[model samples]
Target: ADIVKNLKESMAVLEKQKAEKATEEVSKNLVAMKEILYGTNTEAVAQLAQELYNSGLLSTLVADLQLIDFEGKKDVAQIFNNILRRQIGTRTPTVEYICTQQNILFMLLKGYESPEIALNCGIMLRECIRHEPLAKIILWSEQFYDFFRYVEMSTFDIASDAFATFKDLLTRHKLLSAEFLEQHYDRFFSEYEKLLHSENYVTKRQSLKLLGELLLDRHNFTIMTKYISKPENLKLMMNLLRDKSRNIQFEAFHVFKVFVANPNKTQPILDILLKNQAKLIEFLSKFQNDRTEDEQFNDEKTYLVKQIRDL
Candidate 1:
């Protein structure tokens, strides 16, 4: 109990001290606080851990969480430990490139939605979608990131995808209504148009994928369908599929899935792929190995193949 009191007092002092100090001294104290939190000195840490429990700070989060039991508490502790140790103050993650990655974890913990996390972390939502594909499959739950962020989904480029990022920017910058889309249409389309014409394959692929994903939703379907209906844009995407890299293939699949899902647009692409079934099957066989052939993707593929057989 006393230890918890002392720790809380120390936390207060630490916050106050951190507010006061701006330079080297703050670094030293953060390191010290980290050690205290982690119990760097083994015997001291065990004793402190017990005291922390008794004093209630350790359980404070537990109470806030409202878990059915303590199963999630351990995960929470692990996340807190990783975050506090990795990016707190002085002892930054070994890869400075991962600061944004850690930031997404923090954003996820703070209850920001997935789109918000990608926006804050400055990565693509599709990348976010792909990063922890396995975790999503295994957990079969969307809110898993709410508790743990270090899963494979943890990446530096969390907000690197434009579909979600653009949607987020539109929402964050309050550019939604018909009036807003109209006002910002030029800024929006110009950025993507330039990207579509870019020499960089990666940039072009991202632009195409974003345009395709935007149409997946019923809300944006009209605009996105019209935009992608252009033969020029479809040709650009077709050219991207020529790349044998699984990453590009998967991205192309994501875009193509949107087209197939849209009944109005599915016929043209379906006919083209049917005519080029050899290449399409070759790509599928190659990509079948690249993704989760284990359970999730396998199930998805089995269903898709069965549908084709029925056809």
Candidate 2:
């Protein structure tokens, strides 16, 4: 308990040489704190863990998280990661606690702007997100939209890291995701449209692939229905058919086929499909012909081709 207290005090000393050394003191104390938390003396450690929570050390430490240097920031995350794992009966105390203290989550989300702390923030954010209530908090907030911006950032690792958290928010809780998609359909996919058209190959490719996963998920059936009924949606997939990147074309086909396979495509959808039938048939015949070894793609491609051919 004193370790948590001393850790906070040392950080307050952040008010130069004295503060710098105090910062190092904070780092070492974090390791000591973790040792006790992970210690074999379960009886005493449990009491100390309770004290740690009551201490409000987590909120204080995390509030100053951006100020901590690399090692100290890492130690802070590791301790939080450890604490988030604790359970009391059937309840997760800290996760529930963090829910009430949403500033922590917002601060963590804001960390994605700085590569230095982005990964650490992600580690903690993901664990919090694993719990449904916390995930819902992020999924519902305006910050949820910030992820689209974060995932496209120039730093590859940080950008990709944001995507992992982004994916978890949408994919972790199927029912929640389904509802979120339904409620925010226009806003969500309009933002999503930016990703599919990203000049960044990885961004566009991954977004295309994720779109397939989402649409194909039975949980998102309504979204799939609404998406494929749009002529604009169908045309984007059609345009991707001739993309210079072979793998992009292949991935694009996955999304394209859903439009074809929909038995209830809208009139505009049907009109677009009919207009491109001859051209699509020509493209599909030679499209990735070397993929016969894979039964699934070949089957879908064949199914796609024959449908367009007969159209």
Candidate 3:
């Protein structure tokens, strides 16, 4: 309790001090807070954890993220990471306390405003999302739309890292994801379509891969059925199959196959596939022909070729 109080007081002081003057002390308090939060067992510091949340010190540290220097930013990330790590069990108090804050996660997303803090922000965001309620909060919030911008960042590392968090936000917590998709189907997929057609090869390929995963997951059965029924969505996958990048074609094939493999295909989906039947067979006959060792892929390719031929 005393330790928590002292750290809380120090964080208050650190929050008030200018970035230049506070760097050293902020760094000091971060290390101490991390140690107490993680160095001791949960049972030992449970009260301390509650106090840290109550004192408003935790949110203050998050607010200082962009205000701090490069090293201090990294320290803040580590401190933030430790806080989430300590609250990992089902429905912990800190997790509940965190959900009340308006901008902790949102501010972390803004951390992408600089390359210096992008990865840190991604790390913190992923941790927060590991909690079910936190993940739902982010998905339901308007800020959910910011992911498209993050994934399209010109910087390779930052873009890829942001996509990682974005992927987690969409893929984690199956029930919550299904709920989100059901509720936000139109808006979510409309933004997602832009990704499939993005000029960035990475964005296009990653989104394709994610699409395949979402559609294939049993929890997303309703979403997949609905997605495969759309003619435009099928057209997007077909275009992807012919992409100049072999990897793009390869990723697209996985999703493209989902449409073909759907047991109950709509007339629009079936008509598109039947219209391209001969063309698809001719293309698949030689597509990614180098993967001789991928027996399953080879088998699936043969199956698809025959399926298209019969169409």
Candidate 4:
């Protein structure tokens, strides 16, 4: 009974301190809550918070977010934003979605479903989508995931004003130059390798795809080729070529074909593969958009066919 009373007192004090902006009192309340629930292990605070959330107390608090200002119609949007930053800053996404302007805005920015955003804002689902065009913009930008994971749904609505905010940030930073690109090429390649084999299939596919696109630019090709030939990378390329995932197979094929187009460096690889029972030829043939004439086929299939034809 005394334990329960102290826990409630701690919760009430924390809530009041949050409302009043009393930093010291807020810290004290946090400590009291920690002591009440965790006894000593601070790590247990996360477990306790999650348990409380699952018990519905967090949901009720989120629903009451709009009432935080009491007498005045406060800028409810800003409140939710503060909560999101606070939670994310603390490495916690377990914070409940309170029906405030910020909650709706955050959901939209994070690419939540229309219904989910609506529920967070305590509005009709349609109302959730309608109130925030700005959020949509932020969600759709290339930098969308760069900001935060929405944890659900399609790319953000492109027409939102939120995207405009994203654009402004991009415009301010500007794209880095090729000098930056070359200097960090190895890093990019390393990161891409990690993503290609990511535990998450979608992430793996996406990384390979992004690398393929980046590699297509003439300036990046040389560095990308260097990265591809690092002896340790050969097995991944072979596996990707034979991958069950169509996306991975397609991207890998496209990259392989790019190497085939250049004879100077890749010819040796082609020669070694050709020594086998035409497996390399069969693999390369799968991606050709058009049948190479007898002559083109010879040039494409043989390491010395170019030298032979010059005779």
Candidate 5:
């Protein structure tokens, strides 16, 4: 408990630390806190963890992580990650503990507003998504849409990390994602479409591929059906299919196939495919190299060409 008190005492005068310019001193002290939590003695570690939790330092560290300085931020993430993982088997007590403190999740989510702790916050949120209850709270909340915005930030590392968490949120629990998508189809895809139109090359490529996976999942039958049924949706895929980046085009093709392979096509869908018939067939037939030995892909490409021609 002395270690917990020491940490609390150190943080109580955090403003003083800044005024006094003793950040290095604080960083050194955090390593000491990190030491006992590194599995040196099981009971001692548990003892420190309980006291830390009892003192609400877990939430506090997340709240003040940025103030902790460089390696100190590393120490806090490791320490919090360890405590969050204190449970095993089916008795996820730590997960249960967090459900009661849902505000910490929001704090972590909003941490994206700063590049300093955004990666650490993502680490915590990804772990939180492992538990059904935590992921549910994050998914069903209105703030969940913030992920779309978070992923497009300018800092490459923070932006990429945020996108990783966003991917896990939608794909981790397949059935839950399906349910969420169904309820918020219009809004969800409307926001998601912006990512496809993103100026960032990597965003366009990665989102296209992730979008393909979401559409192809068997559990997402309703989402896929709903997604491909729209003429606007097909229009976007067609635009992506002709993207200047070959990599983007490859991912877009994975999505474009779903539109063509569907048995039932609304007249709008048929009209677009019919209008693009010669142009698409020419594009697919000459879109070569990657599928040189990908016989099945070539077969599928040929099949799509025929499908479009027969329209």
Candidate 6:
């Protein structure tokens, strides 16, 4: 209880101190607050964790994130992460708080608008996604589409971290992700397609990697079958095979091959493959020829070349 009281008091002061305007006195208190939560005993961690939620300090701390300096933002994010770690076995009050007071999650999302807080926000969001209820809330929220904006952030590190969290949101729980994708297929993929075509090399590369995982995972078989059925989807993938970056083109080949490898290809899919057969054969024959040591990849390359040639 005493530790909880001190935590609340320190948080209150830090909350009031602007990151730009933080003073020596306020900075010391903020560090002390971080100390109380960081590397402390389990009982103390849990008590402070619950109090942070119940006393409304959690939201306050979240709000301060935007106004805080780099180290300050890091401290707040670390403290929040510590509390979440302490709640591993039981129902976490902080998770419940975010579930009920969802804007806390939104605030974290908004934190991405600033580079200083982006990685921290990503770290905290990954923690939130570990809990089923919190993950669902984040998935089903109307702001679900806004995740693309985070992933497309101008800063490379920030964009990459946001993409990592985005991947977790979809891959953490297979059932939930499949449901979300099934129910919101049009909206979800409409936005997703943009990532595949993004001007940013990293975004396009990573998104392609994730797209392959999502479509190939058994959990998303329903979505996968539906995705490969579209001629436009095939066309998009074929173009990716011609992407300027060798790495990007290689990633694109993994997905494009799935369309060709489907035993039961839709006519639209087959027609696209037949039409592009000559071009695909010509390009793939020399594509990544240096990967001669990768026997499996070479085998698949030979198989795909034959499949297209025989078309």
The global C-alpha lDDT for each of the candidates, from Candidate 1 onward, is: 0.42, 0.85, 0.80, 0.42, 0.83, 0.79
Candidate 5, 1-311: lDDT as tens digits: 77667666667668443524446556656787677667622334456446666888778778878777777887887877777776644576678888889998999999998887888888888888887788999999998999888889768898899899899989999888888889999899999999999989989988999999999899999888888989998999999888888899999999999999999988889899998888998998898656587787788798998888888
Q: Where's the lowest-lDDT run of ten residues in candidate 5?
A: 40-49
Residues 1-311 of candidate 2: C-alpha lDDT, one tens digit per residue: 67888987887787323866887888789789777778421345567667877877888777788668888788888888888877766778788888888988998999899878899999999988889999999989998999989999768999998998999889999999999999999999999998888888888888888899999999999998999998888889988877889888878988998999877778898899888778888888888987778899889888988777766
lDDT of 6 by residue, 1-311 (tens): 45445545655665652433344444565687677665533345555456556777667777767556678777777777777665545656666677788887888877778777778888888888888788888899887677899889877888888888889999999999899999999989999998887888888899999999998899999999999999988889988888889999988988988999888999889998887778888888899999788887898899998888877
lDDT of 3 by residue, 225-263 (tens): 898899998898898888889999999999988889776
Per-residue error for 118 in candidate 2, Å, reads: 0.8
Candidate 1: worst-modelled 10 consecutive residues by lDDT? 144-153
Q: Which scores greater on TM-score, model 2 or model 6?
A: 2
TM-scores for the candidates: 0.38, 0.94, 0.90, 0.39, 0.91, 0.89
Rate residue 2 of model 1 by lDDT: 48
Candidate 4, run of 10 with poorest lDDT: 70-79
lDDT of 3: 0.80
Colliding residue pairs in candidate 3: none
**What C-alpha lDDT, on a 0 to 100 scale, does residue 90 get in candidate 2?**
76
Model 6 global lDDT (CA atoms, 0 to 1): 0.79
Instruction: Show the lowest summed lDDT stretch of 10 residues, model 3.
Output: 13-22
Best by lDDT: 2
- Candidate 2 local lDDT, residue 278: 84
Q: Which residues of candidate 1, in runs, are more than 4 Å off?
A: 1-167, 171-191, 201-209, 266-271, 293-311
**Ranking of all candidate structures by their TM-score, best first:** 2, 5, 3, 6, 4, 1
Single out the weakest 10-residue window by summed lDDT for candidate 2: 39-48
- Residue 117 deviation, candidate 2, in Å? 0.4
| Alpha carbon deviation, residue 72, candidate 2 (Å) | 2.3
Leading candidate by TM-score = 2
RMSD list, candidates in order:
14.7, 2.1, 2.5, 16.6, 2.6, 2.9
